[PDB]
Design a protein around this ligand. Structure first.
Ligand SMILES: O=[N+]([O-])c1cc(N2CCOCC2)ccc1NCc1cccc(CN2C[C@H](O)[C@@H](O)[C@H](O)[C@H]2CO)c1
Ligand SMILES: *[C@@H]1O[C@H](CO)[C@@H](O)[C@H](O)[C@H]1NC(C)=O
Length: 765
């Protein structure tokens, strides 16, 4: 049955718009196969199209916004693009039609509506770019009956091992198609849909923009050669209309020009399915997917007071649909320093200078290829896998579709090397590398990231204890299937645990360090004078200078989270030897959190170093780090330490702003200094952890139940309304929020863990 659910999840999830780095495109979960991409731009002059054309996601003054209004990767979705520069409101509706043996069929409608400001007769160029990688696959444009291009539909006929036989149709579309009475029309036609069919080596097919412009430039070179000149120039839209040359190749460019409003359809028909897809199919399936999205949303994300209103519901659907709509399929080589240079052990003072010298040897090499199926923080800015972000992304996704969440976790754990390392940042293939400066591509096998993916597995275990609709819950509805998933994953989870203890070890023994345990102490590798990027809290102030004796209380808490998950999953699997080892470790972390990281003087947890005089010194910077044992749920609800942390959380003069908890206390000397990234702003991911833990305490007998209930109620309200007000005014989820003003700041489209807000609204954790 596990096998069967496997095959059905593959077939369900194979096709999608799994190219979140571009406005609209499709690819299957196959490395070397069929990819599609949409381009558009106004053309008003001989030189503006190069500057107006849209392909890869950006955010600037020229784009009002964009995002998914609805999405489910099994069914499809509707995306809205609001383009100020090109005067266009675009709708891309995508829908999946199951059948046959090759992951089924799909359809998309592209709709462009000129905004009020645009000239009514604006000319818009639209390109549908189709590419196919694979040594023994084929794709052919069926020629038109007509001389110069297509009056109707364009038909591509294709074959591969992976997809079988298929046809891809770009429909004629609705809208005015401009006509040229110029002399050139004798040789290029008056104006019509055109197709150019090309071949390049498989590894450059992704470079859609340069491949297009190279064809456009050949077109213009031909005009200059053939006496079309400034005495009598063709109109700009005809100078930029490719000469029709359909045929066979691994690239197919389908170009249309519209005057005013336009729409056209893309119909992908898997031959192994029944009848080929029609525009009527598309319209029907789009209606259906919308009804299904509506029904699932009211079940899965039932928003509780005071967020029951339609305005909060619209907000929730937008925050949710952008998070799940960010799911991409990435394939290619990763850049990795496999030197394991000894400078990376960081056992000396000044270790960051040694580590710099090792990096400057540039021993990194490309390795893989690898594949990843994952949600992303940011389409325009960070369209790739981030290890601790994904833990946050999958909490709402797992509610919606636990089986999808488990596929993504599986995809992440298939990246783990023999040692138990997954790169914190997954830059797979040249297309992914193009969005990243060379200096920042290289991953390091000694750099960890919080294991937030365990928090999702915790939600799954609690659920496992206590056809699309069926597939979505098959791994909890069939406990046999769920246990078997954990059985295969468990060894990887245990390998990572051991990797953390081996590679991120703190030094107790070699200093005057008293503690209940000689084993349990941890230090994030990879820290520089002003940063600790591996912790995920880039510039939170840490002990100065960095030191091999440093201990980080957040890292110990994360190991705590891991052991509690391994106890749970080990138990379900009856790994009794293993569960006994974990239990001793958990008891040891509970004691050493206190002996090594608790400040009675400050009333909070702190990182440690060793002094100028080689003694253990606590270093207290009141903020998120200080709360970590509480945030990761390691503290008993009756703990006096917890009560002191609730006093810090609630204190307006330290962390409590009207807009949520400040990353750093207003009292801390590093408040609003340097880049001020994690040194004051309100971050939705850590606020979410705090809201879940306050709720935990509010729903138990104990001495802080009522303090927790009050703080839970207000914190939930402050975080949701801050993100809501900003979405209302700007159309964006933001990366962080200003604790003085409430404004969203840094990066837009952060869906992204800011989308945790859908879960905070639905409550009942
Ligand atoms: O140096 N940069 O290439 C760079 C460029 C830009 N630009 C691009 C063009 O213009 C607009 C903004 C912005 C920031 C950076 N900073 C470093 C950076 C690298 C990768 C991800 C993140 C975001 N998160 C940071 C979180 O702290 C972490 O926890 C989380 O895991 C991670 C993923 O969400 C930050
Ligand atoms: C989907 O299934 C095929 C064959 O059953 C397999 O090769 C592939 O690995 C599966 N998915 C992924 C991305 O592994």
């Amino acid at each position: 049955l596990h096998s069967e659910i496997g095959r059905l999840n593959n077939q369900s999830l194979l096709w999608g718009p799994y190219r979140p780095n571009i406005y609209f495109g499709t690819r299957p979960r196959i490395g070397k196969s069929l990819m599609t991409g949409l381009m558009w731009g106004k053309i008003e002059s001989y030189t503006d199209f190069q500057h107006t054309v849209r392909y890869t996601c950006e955010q600037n003054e020229g784009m009002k916004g964009y995002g998914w209004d609805e999405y489910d990767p099994r069914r499809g979705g509707i995306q809205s693009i609001h383009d100020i520069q090109n005067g266009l409101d675009i709708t891309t509706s995508f829908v999946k039609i199951p059948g046959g043996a090759h992951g089924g069929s799909w359809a998309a409608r592209i709709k462009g509506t000129l905004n009020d400001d645009a000239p009514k007769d604006q000319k818009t160029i639209v390109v549908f770019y189709v590419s196919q990688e694979g040594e023994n696959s084929e794709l052919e444009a069926v020629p038109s009956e007509n001389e110069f291009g297509y009056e109707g539909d364009v038909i591509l006929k294709g074959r591969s091992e992976a997809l079988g036989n298929y046809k891809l149709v770009v429909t004629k579309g609705k809208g005015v198609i401009p006509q040229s009475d110029h002399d050139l029309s004798r040789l290029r036609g008056p104006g019509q849909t055109v197709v150019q069919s090309l071949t390049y080596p498989d590894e450059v097919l992704w470079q859609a923009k340069p491949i297009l412009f190279q064809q456009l430039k050949a077109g213009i070179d031909w005009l200059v050669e053939n006496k079309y000149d400034v005495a009598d120039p063709p109109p700009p839209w005809q100078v930029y209309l490719l000469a029709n040359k359909p045929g066979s190749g691994n690239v197919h460019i389908v170009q249309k020009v519209f005057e005013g409003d336009f729409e056209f359809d893309i119909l992908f028909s898997s031959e192994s399915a029944g009848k080929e897809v029609t525009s009527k199919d598309l319209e029907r399936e789009v209606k259906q997917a919308t009804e299904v999205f509506g029904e699932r949303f009211a079940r899965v994300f039932d928003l509780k007071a005071p967020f029951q209103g339609d305005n909060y519901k619209k907000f929730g659907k937008s925050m949710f649909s952008n998070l799940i709509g960010g799911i991409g399929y990435f394939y290619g080589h990763s850049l990795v320093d496999r030197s394991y240079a000894p400078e990376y052990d960081e056992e000396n003072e000044g270790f960051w200078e040694d580590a710099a010298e090792a990096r400057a040897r540039h021993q990194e090499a490309l390795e893989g290829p690898y594949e990843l199926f994952t949600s992303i923080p940011s389409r325009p800015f960070f369209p790739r896998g981030f290890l601790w972000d994904e833990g946050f992304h999958l909490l709402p996704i797992a509610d919606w579709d636990i089986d999808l969440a488990l596929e993504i976790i599986k995809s992440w754990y298939n990246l783990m090397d023999e040692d138990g390392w997954i790169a914190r940042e997954q830059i797979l293939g040249a297309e992914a590398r193009s969005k990243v400066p060379k200096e920042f591509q290289t991953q390091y096998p000694h750099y960890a990231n919080p294991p937030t993916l365990f928090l999702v597995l915790d939600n799954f275990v609690e659920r496992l204890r206590k056809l699309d609709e069926t597939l979505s819950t098959a791994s909890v509805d069939n406990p046999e299937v769920g246990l078997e998933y954990l059985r295969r994953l468990y060894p990887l989870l245990r390998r990572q645990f051991d990797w953390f203890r081996k590679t991120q070890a703190g030094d107790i023994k070699s200093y005057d360090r008293e503690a209940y345990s000689t084993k349990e102490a941890y230090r994030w590798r990879g820290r520089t004078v002003s940063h600790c990027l591996t912790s995920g809290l880039d510039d939170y102030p840490r002990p100065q200078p960095p030191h091999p004796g440093e201990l980080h209380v957040d890292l110990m808490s994360w190991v705590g989270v891991m052991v509690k998950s391994l106890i749970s999953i080990g138990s379900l699997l009856g790994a009794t030897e293993d569960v006994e080892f974990y239990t001793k470790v958990l008891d040891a972390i509970e004691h050493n959190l206190d002996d090594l990281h608790w400040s009675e003087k400050e009333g909070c947890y702190c990182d440690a170093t060793i002094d100028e005089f080689e003694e253990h010194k606590l270093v207290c910077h009141k903020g998120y780090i200080s709360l970590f044992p509480f945030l990761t749920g390691l503290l008993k609800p009756d703990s006096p330490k917890l009560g002191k942390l609730l006093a810090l959380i609630g204190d307006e003069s330290e962390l409590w702003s009207p807009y949520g908890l400040r990353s750093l206390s207003k009292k801390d000397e590093f408040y609003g200094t340097a880049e001020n990234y994690w040194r004051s702003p309100v971050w939705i991911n850590i606020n979410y952890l705090a809201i879940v833990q306050l709720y935990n305490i509010a729903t138990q007998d104990g001495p802080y139940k009522e303090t927790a209930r009050d703080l839970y109620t207000r914190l939930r309200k402050n975080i949701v309304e801050t993100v809501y007000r900003n979405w209302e005014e700007t159309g964006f989820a933001w990366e962080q929020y200003n604790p003085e003003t409430g404004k969203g700041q840094r990066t837009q489209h952060f869906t992204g863990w800011t989308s945790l807000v859908v879960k905070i609204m639905s409550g009942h954790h």
